[PDB]
Amino acid sequence: GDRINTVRGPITISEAGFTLTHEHICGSSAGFLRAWPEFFGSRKALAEKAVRGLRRARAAGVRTIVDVSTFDLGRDVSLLAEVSRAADVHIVAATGLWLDPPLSMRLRSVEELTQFFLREIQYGIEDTGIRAGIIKVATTGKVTPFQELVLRAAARASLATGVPVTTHTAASQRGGEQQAAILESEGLSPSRVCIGHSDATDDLSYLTALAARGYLIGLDRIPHSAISWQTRALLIKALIDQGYTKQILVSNDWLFGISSYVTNIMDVMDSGNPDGMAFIPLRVIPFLREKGIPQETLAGITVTNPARFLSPTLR
Amino acid sequence: GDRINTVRGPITISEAGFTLTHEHICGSSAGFLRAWPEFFGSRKALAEKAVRGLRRARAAGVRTIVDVSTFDLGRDVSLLAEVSRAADVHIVAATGLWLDPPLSMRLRSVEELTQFFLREIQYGIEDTGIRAGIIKVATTGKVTPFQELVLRAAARASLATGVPVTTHTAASQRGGEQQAAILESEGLSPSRVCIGHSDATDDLSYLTALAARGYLIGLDRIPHSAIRSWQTRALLIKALIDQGYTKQILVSNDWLFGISSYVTNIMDVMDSGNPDGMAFIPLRVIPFLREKGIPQETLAGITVTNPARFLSPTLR
Ligand SMILES: C[As](C)(=O)[O-]
Ligand SMILES: C[As](C)(=O)[O-]
Ligand SMILES: [Zn+2]
Numbered sequence: 001g002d003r004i005n006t007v008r009g010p011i012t013i014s015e016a017g018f019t020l021t022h023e024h025i026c027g028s029s030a031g032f033l034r035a036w037p038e039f040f041g042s043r044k045a046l047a048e049k050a051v052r053g054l055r056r057a058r059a060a061g062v063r064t065i066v067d068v069s070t071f072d073l074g075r076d077v078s079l080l081a082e083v084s085r086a087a088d089v090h091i092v093a094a095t096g097l098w099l100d101p102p103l104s105m106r107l108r109s110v111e112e113l114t115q116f117f118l119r120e121i122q123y124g125i126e127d128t129g130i131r132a133g134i135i136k137v138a139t140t141g142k143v144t145p146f147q148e149l150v151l152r153a154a155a156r157a158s159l160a161t162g163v164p165v166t167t168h169t170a171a172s173q174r175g176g177e178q179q180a181a182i183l184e185s186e187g188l189s190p191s192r193v194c195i196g197h198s199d200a201t202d203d204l205s206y207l208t209a210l211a212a213r214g215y216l217i218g219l220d221r222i223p224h225s226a227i228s229w230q231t232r233a234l235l236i237k238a239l240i241d242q243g244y245t246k247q248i249l250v251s252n253d254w255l256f257g258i259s260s261y262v263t264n265i266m267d268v269m270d271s272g273n274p275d276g277m278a279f280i281p282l283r284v285i286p287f288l289r290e291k292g293i294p295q296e297t298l299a300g301i302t303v304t305n306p307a308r309f310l311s312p313t314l315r
Numbered sequence: 316g317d318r319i320n321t322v323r324g325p326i327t328i329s330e331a332g333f334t335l336t337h338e339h340i341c342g343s344s345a346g347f348l349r350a351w352p353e354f355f356g357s358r359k360a361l362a363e364k365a366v367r368g369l370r371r372a373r374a375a376g377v378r379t380i381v382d383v384s385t386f387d388l389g390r391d392v393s394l395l396a397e398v399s400r401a402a403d404v405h406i407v408a409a410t411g412l413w414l415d416p417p418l419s420m421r422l423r424s425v426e427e428l429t430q431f432f433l434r435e436i437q438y439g440i441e442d443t444g445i446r447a448g449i450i451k452v453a454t455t456g457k458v459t460p461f462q463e464l465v466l467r468a469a470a471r472a473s474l475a476t477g478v479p480v481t482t483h484t485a486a487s488q489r490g491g492e493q494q495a496a497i498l499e500s501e502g503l504s505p506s507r508v509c510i511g512h513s514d515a516t517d518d519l520s521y522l523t524a525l526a527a528r529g530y531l532i533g534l535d536r537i538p539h540s541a542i543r544s545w546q547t548r549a550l551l552i553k554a555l556i557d558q559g560y561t562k563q564i565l566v567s568n569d570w571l572f573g574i575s576s577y578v579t580n581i582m583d584v585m586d587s588g589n590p591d592g593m594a595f596i597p598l599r600v601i602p603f604l605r606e607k608g609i610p611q612e613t614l615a616g617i618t619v620t621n622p623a624r625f626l627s628p629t630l631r
């Protein structure tokens with residue numbers, strides 16, 4: 001109940017501390033980092049940049065990140081373990097599928113996909129023994145037949161293991177409502193689910209209604225506006241004011257290299273947000289305190305809500 | 316110069332022997348074999364099946380295969396090296412891209428794709444030091460804009476290294492004609508190019524015209540008609556011989572020992588339809604052609620001489 005899986009092994013949830021629940025070391029494609037590391041300068045250069053960035057985040061307060069990179073985002077859990085250790089920042093790895101499944105994933109059934117997700121949660125990723133601590137799913141605004149299979153497999157895996165589900169969403173298409181209906185149709189409890197990229201919208205009724213059902217709300221792309229970001233942050237305040245503090249999760253959706261986008265967008269992002277993953281502790285947290293948000297409510301959001309979210313719970 | 320790179324290192328062209336120029340150990344997707352080996356039972360079970368299948372081909376006279384699995388077909392050159400050593404069959408590895416490129420590939424420029432294909436030929440694949448000895452390219456319909464980028468990057472990598480290009484085509488759409496036009500626009504000699512999956516048509520004049528331009532003609536899915544008869548497809552070999560284009564013919568099975576990039580259990584369907592596997596060409600097509608009057612010097616030219624000329628890196 002009280003044990004989380006990280007790339008360095010099992011920890012107790014009290015050690016997780018302050019947690020960023022939607023991040024990436026590298027946004028890529030399956031096999032790509034190993035086949036073409038010099039797209040990132042080199043693998044060594046990429047690991048060093050992530051270590052520097054994670055160390056700055058740790059200085060600013062962060063203890064744990066959740067790397068929500070799936071198989072098809074090029075998750076390299078060996079890289080995650082190397083940089084977690086050098087930075088001394090906990091990293092939770094993910095299973096699931098994002099928006100770029102290859103044929104060998106697109107053609108699988110819900111049962112087969114369920115077995116794959118259970119493999120990565122219960123046995124380990126590839127040949128590393130590193131077990132995922134969260135399931136990441138991505139859908140387009142209107143859920144495709146394959147993405148619905150992914151959703152159902154995520155729910156079945158989450159129910160067999162208690163590990164949570166976190167989603168990629170088109171918030172401006174109310175993407176979370178269709179995901180929730182599918183997930184609930186599988187008997188998945190909403191307190192096991194986080195509707196992500198939920199800060200890309202003004203629709204507070206959309207945001208407030210999912211929280212009331214028990215969903216976690218991911219305001220995980222605040223710094224991306226800064227390429228205003230306080231309008232996005234003010235959604236955290238708006239939700240606290242409606243009484244849904246136990247339902248907010250905040251993050252940067254940052255990364256230190258990206259190949260699944262046009263070339264050189266990493267440098268435009270870094271010179272737009274020099275703070276990287278430190279943006280949440282350094283710029284958002286004090287902005288919220290300076291609107292009268294109690295220090296204690298923030299610790300609940302940045303520490304307590306992620307701990308409740310990640311604890312394997314058959315409930 | 317007269318050396319061909321394999322997954323065990325360089326070999327001289329005389330070492331290649333009887334060569335199957337379009338084959339696969341495993342038809343999969345990037346990262347998939349290592350993330351989900353149990354899809355194939357296990358990595359060990361897949362390797363053992365491939366060793367038996369390659370040993371069966373070897374006993375039917377095969378000495379080399381060209382594994383034309385790209386990055387996005389889940390090529391695992393460590394697996395190819397293991398099974399090559401256990402079976403004593405040379406395996407040439409491929410660079411290039413097939414029809415399932417992930418986003419990190421689809422968003423690259425022709426200049427970036429060129430660098431990737433060059434790295435796999437000149438430096439090595441992943442961190443294994445195994446260098447590709449062929450560039451595989453697939454297109455559909457009229458070539459998509461991205462596929463044209465791959466075609467041009469392949470031409471540029473070939474022109475820099477002398478390594479040949481081999482293609483996946485839809486022959487029923489005469490897909491080789493657009494491939495040839497794009498490659499020739501880059502300055503690539505047709506003698507460096509094998510237009511593959513060419514047996515899946517009856518349009519002999521389409522094939523003859525490409526051969527007349529100096530393209531190699533890949534007649535590589537004959538066993539797939541065995542579940543048109545495979546003998547009908549095999550007569551395209553004799554037809555090209557009779558027009559005097561024996562030099563342009565490459566024959567293969569397009570077989571594999573595991574496949575994840577299709578519906579589950581298709582491998583059982585393929586194996587029961589073609590129990591010969593990669594031995595289909597030597598055990599069935601070669602005898603059939605002999606019985607139709609093709610002499611041994613011609614069959615040895617097709618299966619030994621043609622692949623050696625094709626694979627030997629050449630800037631001429
Ligand atoms: C890898 As993303 C930009 O969908 O969080
Ligand atoms: C079966 As194929 C298109 O990989 O030659
Ligand atoms: Zn996302």
Ligand SMILES: [Zn+2]
Pocket residue numbers: 022023024068253
């Ligand atoms: Zn993300």
Ligand SMILES: [Zn+2]
Pocket residue numbers: 483484512
């Ligand atoms: Zn093909």
Ligand SMILES: [Zn+2]
Pocket residue numbers: 337338339383569
């Ligand atoms: Zn093939």
